[PDB]
Symmetry: none
Subunit: 640 residues, 2 copies
């Protein structure tokens, strides 16, 4: 109907005008206080919709069902349902019944308080008496908190105490310099709506101590989420952020204000960690009387999540990367307990949840070393540490014998001229190489040569006993690990490189530590485990016991022999079986790209700890085993 | 070894697919620049030569052949393929191409030169345009009156956003439909259609005669198009045409790159003869204009005309007499088999199927439950009680039916025993003592089923196999051979008795029904129907004996002349008629309960000059095909004498 075509539109656009918080568009389109029915004056919605929704912060009003009929010559009526979300939880449902007005295009709604709530007599106030639930903690193995609530410093200003003029602008400068803010953020944080110069407007939330206080600045205590390790655990733990309307749209069960996880475990365990706040609306009628309030809730605190993480080992693993790109995973391999999941470089989770400028958020996003990435959950080529695996498969299927002695001359080898420029590279020119020599000197030519004999079928049959393609039961995103891009290599180069961990393998450090724990479990593979009360899951006979008793003594010699590639760790005087690794990522736009350093290490005398550590795009004499000591000493002092 | 030439393979394939779809940006988007060992021109100077030669000839459908990619150097390559190409003038078959590739950064590049596009020239020349279009031929009726023709038309329509907005928008629809004999929701329907929007011109109606002053939004366009004088009344037979799709040229490589093509009916069946061959002189040249050799040269030849047996006025009379109901009607001259009328109702307007498609309306009346796209005259049905005359004819031939035999039938329903359950053959008039002639007059199904059971199944099939069951008729109409049954044996007394009066698994379309019923106008000879006027008459001798004809036809006149005949209303016409009515209820051993159909067969038994059969699906009683018969009958009697 062309006459009332603006009758369906001019109610839903008002409902969305209340959704986005612009109450004056809503309270700007009413006729007057005419006697139909009463109703209420044009300018007497001044404190209404603002002082009732300031403590409520209600958003998410949606209709989903609109059909308007006719009643009189000048009356069209409502009868439909709606829902919304306020500070006290979900309010479903709402029944709306209101009348229209007959005008020349100005389809004016005759609002009376029945259209806000399904019954409202008039001229009455409310009482909130709210109580706020606390978010659940995230604890380590020993109950040390990785995410909890702390007392923070709320920084703000009141505009009247800054003065006027060049003295006021100089105070604005002094605030911006002291609070590490901009002048423009302060100027339109103040110069906005709802402001009057004696109002305390907030500007920033600090975890550390109070800075310099120029005239106008104002300090307050505030309760918020705190991360005692911060950067050292940021990618794992994540951060929380304020509720937006878009999260209300995905899950209307949420509140209107409050916190929501945006990454890491805070997003992964958001439902368990959140809980529900307490308090009720309590519409009075200016004497103490209560009518009745329909949909309401009680208080319920969030639940705690306890991890297998060792906080001190997490910090030692992160600090040992020295701000460079890399990742470190440590486990107790008999159990699968993830002791540390460090990813570097990292971001500051406290500043991300306490208000971070767009300056710094893009500086984190502009950083080519990508500090937002969970590198322990990112697939890499494992590097030449993976020689342990193919050696193990070779001792299982009878194609690799430890007495076999290959003659290799030089540093470079290719199968024929068909390989063109590509050739397998090694570091030490050792003429006579058996398997133990290959493992001590990290000889890639030996294993690639012994991967082409014992070809693809024997090789992939050994690899298929591992966890390739499996989704691990962990609260981390984690692509499954792949052998190669396709079901077959279709080339000797790819097979040969797969033999020493290059090529198209993609294995993240966590599933990399899963595959490597067979050397501490006599061939049984023990799955990683992050939640401290999940029961252990293994997978038996992935490799044979005799492969383990052949390889692990040679991995001891990787440390103990002066020619060992991890001989520097011999100086620590602790029992170690180790494997170093390289991987050359070519980045096929220029030649001779970046090289990553790897270290696998565990204690072979008690099997109580294991570590895999990646250092990505190393520089000269910089390696993952150079960075490993302080974590190793910690692990064997405290995991025996 | 190396995979560089597989990138050259995919590059040549993407280059061909970019030339075929027409995007000359991507065709010149992976070429080199002006050099001595690279592409001959720049990027903006290669698109300039495609859009005025390939785009001028509307070059579509490059089909690749035996693509060889090899390697003579490390930076340059050598590819040599064969192909075929479709032009405005038709199709060139055998030609050889070659070229050289390039390597910069892992992705490969084609080094262009002006003989990869034409196999003998080198550069510095242009060719355009030299085509001479041909006209599609006519489909004519028996007397030269056209049923499909090409010529100039005037059609009306609307164009947004010159319809406007607000009420002033709908204010323009109130002036159009008022002035051009239309409705308003149809105007709102054609703008609410698919992606075609807004500056396209959306057609509404063909305008005859002078153009009035137009209201806002109204748009008149003059087009040289395909027209159908009878419209819906022959839409199923004639069909409609559309534009030539790349799919249509993939199925037939001999077609020209553009033009019109039949999409249904006779226009599809005769498309090659109806179209012609364009003329032109697409050649190779130099910059001045002198030529060395030619590529394609053909004298233009317009499409040929195809004269049918159809009578335009009888066809229109047969279609209007169905009154929009579901049904069919076939009319012939039985001595020669000329198909005078082939009417199928309901129908669609073929002029709107050519002048636009109207996708939202296409799906609207192709999922119409009355399914008007179906050519019901080529669709197999149960022939109904009319088929008794065939069973009688077989019975008097093989001796198992004698006219003097009187059965005693009491009631209106009959079954052989109770092993038939609830099923019973039904009659309409409760006549106690019924001979063959009584059973043809009153249309008594119970006499015929009884006499069919007494006759063998082998006696019955032996007579049926002298008809055209399983034969492919030599007609340019798609149809299935008519069937006696789903299986070679009935293996059921119910199925056999019902087949005896035209029900069961018997499937015969109205054109096949006219062919079988022609024995009664040719003394037992079956005359095959023909649709093309010049085709020789085809017959089949002694399908039934002539004494059976001289027994049955005197009874068919009394179906009209006797007060109890089921076609006695036709006796008011005062014209000599022999007739047989029929019914068929849609329920058998292996189907769902549906409706009732109302058949009529009639012809002149004095001069054997015309014959009709009409079906009228979903009778909805107070109606029958005998009720809708008389106007086509008076026309046939006056014009085929």
């Amino acid at each position: 109907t062309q006459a009332v075509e603006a009758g369906e539109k001019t109610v839903e656009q008002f409902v969305q005008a209340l959704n986005k918080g612009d109450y004056n568009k809503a309270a700007g389109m009413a006729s007057k206080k005419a006697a139909n029915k009463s109703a209420l004056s044009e300018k007497e919605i001044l404190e209404k919709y603002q002082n009732i929704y300031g403590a409520a912060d209600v958003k998410g009003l949606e209709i989903s069902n609109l059909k308007v009929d006719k009643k009189d010559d000048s009356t069209y009526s409502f009868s439909y349902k709606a829902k919304m979300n306020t500070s006290l939880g979900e309010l479903k449902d709402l029944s709306y019944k209101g009348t229209l007005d007959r005008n020349d295009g100005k389809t004016t709604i005759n609002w009376q308080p029945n259209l806000v709530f399904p019954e409202m007599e008039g001229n009455d106030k409310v009482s909130l008496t709210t109580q706020e639930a606390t978010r659940g903690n995230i604890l380590d193995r020993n109950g040390e908190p990785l995410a909890t609530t702390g007392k923070l410093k709320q920084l703000g200003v009141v505009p009247s105490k800054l003065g006027d003029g060049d003295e006021k602008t100089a105070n604005i400068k002094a605030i911006a310099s002291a609070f590490d803010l901009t002048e423009d953020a302060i100027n339109q944080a103040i110069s906005q709506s709802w402001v009057q110069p004696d109002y305390f407007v907030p500007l920033k939330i600090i975890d550390g101590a109070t800075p310099e206080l120029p005239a106008g600045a104002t300090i307050q205590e505030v309760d918020g989420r705190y991360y005692p390790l911060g950067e050292a655990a940021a990618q794992l733990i994540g951060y929380v952020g304020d509720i937006t309307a878009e999260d209300i749209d995905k899950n209307p069960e949420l509140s209107s204000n409050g916190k929501i996880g945006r990454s890491g475990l805070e997003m992964a365990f958001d439902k368990d960690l959140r809980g529900t706040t307490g308090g009720k609306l309590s519409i009075t009628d200016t004497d103490g009387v209560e009518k009745k309030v329909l949909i309401e809730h009680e208080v319920q605190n969030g639940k705690d999540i306890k991890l297998t993480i060792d906080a001190k080992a997490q910090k030692t693993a992160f600090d040992s990367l020295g701000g460079k790109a890399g990742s470190t995973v440590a486990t107790t391999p008999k159990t699968g307990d993830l002791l540390a999941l460090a990813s570097s470089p990292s971001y500051d989770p406290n500043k991300m949840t306490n208000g971070i400028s767009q300056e710094d958020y893009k500086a984190y996003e502009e950083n080519p070393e990508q500090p937002f990435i969970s590198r322990f959950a990112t697939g890499y080529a494992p590097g030449s540490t993976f020689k342990m695996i193919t050696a193990a498969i070779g001792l299982d299927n009878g194609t690799i014998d430890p007495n076999e002695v290959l003659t290799i001359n030089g540093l470079k080898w290719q199968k024929d001229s068909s390989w063109g420029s590509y050739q397998v590279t090694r570091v030490s020119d050792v003429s006579q190489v058996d398997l133990k020599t290959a493992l001590i000197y990290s000889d890639n030519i030996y294993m690639a040569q012994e991967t082409l004999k014992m070809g693809e079928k024997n090789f992939r049959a050994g690899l298929d006993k591992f966890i390739f393609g499996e989704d691990l039961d962990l609260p981390i995103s984690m692509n499954p690990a792949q052998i190669s891009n396709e079901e077959s290599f279709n080339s000797d180069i790819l097979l040969a490189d797969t033999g020493y961990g290059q090529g198209e393998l993609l294995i993240n450090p966590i599933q990399q530590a899963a595959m490597y724990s067979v050397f501490a479990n006599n061939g049984t593979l023990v799955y990683p485990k992050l939640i401290a009360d999940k029961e252990t899951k293994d997978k038996k006979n992935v490799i044979g016991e005799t492969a383990v008793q052949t390889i692990v003594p040679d991995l001891r010699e990787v440390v103990q022999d002066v020619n060992g590639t991890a001989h520097s760790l011999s100086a620590l005087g602790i029992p170690l079986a180790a494997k170093t690794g390289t991987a050359e990522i070519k980045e096929k736009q220029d030649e001779k790209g970046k090289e990553n350093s790897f270290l696998f290490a565990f204690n072979p005398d008690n099997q109580e700890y294991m570590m895999v550590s990646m250092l990505e795009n190393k520089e000269d004499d910089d390696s993952a085993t150079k960075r490993a000591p302080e974590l190793l000493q910690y692990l064997n002092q405290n995991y025996q």
